[PDB]
């Protein structure tokens, strides 16, 4: 319901991700990662809300799914391909609120025990 923003290009790209939530609806095709994943931000793009997505090949007759690390939804070892997805979400989650830049990296000394 909320929540599209409209920056996620970076160099690159390698392939894209097309998929679709309803099975009568098409595969809406997205612009992906240069590794091979997605930024949570396209997955928002077209599903809003969505925390997770399945995987649902007709052909593959599997159980597959999307894997979904910080927010950057993984390809499996095949690829997104051009099949159906299913999501995964109660409704909404958020759970952000905060956007600064700053910089706190700093050396750690050796830490051994037993």
Same mark, same amino acid.
């Given at each position: 319901?909320?929540?599209?923003?409209?920056?996620?290009?970076?160099?690159?790209?390698?392939?894209?991700? /097309?998929?679709? *939530?309803?099975?009568?609806?098409? +595969?809406?095709?997205?612009?992906?990662?240069?590794?091979?994943? $997605?930024?949570?931000?396209?997955?928002?793009?077209?599903?809003?809300?969505?925390?997770?997505?399945?995987?649902?090949?007709?052909?593959?007759?599997?159980?597959?799914?999307? /894997?979904?690390? *910080?927010?950057?939804?993984?390809? +499996?070892?095949?690829?997104?391909?051009?099949?159906?997805?299913? $999501?995964?979400?109660?409704?909404?989650?958020?759970?952000?609120?905060?956007?600064?830049?700053?910089?706190?990296?700093?050396?750690?000394?050796?830490?051994?025990?037993?």
């Amino acid at each position: 319901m909320a929540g599209s923003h409209h920056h996620h290009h970076h160099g690159s790209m390698s392939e894209y991700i /097309r998929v679709t *939530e309803d099975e009568n609806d098409e +595969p809406i095709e997205i612009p992906s990662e240069d590794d091979g994943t $997605v930024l949570l931000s396209t997955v928002t793009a077209q599903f809003p809300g969505a925390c997770g997505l399945r995987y649902r090949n007709p052909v593959s007759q599997c159980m597959r799914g999307v /894997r979904l690390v *910080e927010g950057i939804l993984h390809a +499996p070892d095949a690829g997104w391909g051009n099949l159906v997805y299913v $999501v995964n979400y109660p409704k909404d989650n958020k759970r952000k609120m905060d956007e600064t830049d700053a910089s706190s990296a700093v050396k750690v000394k050796r830490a051994v025990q037993k």
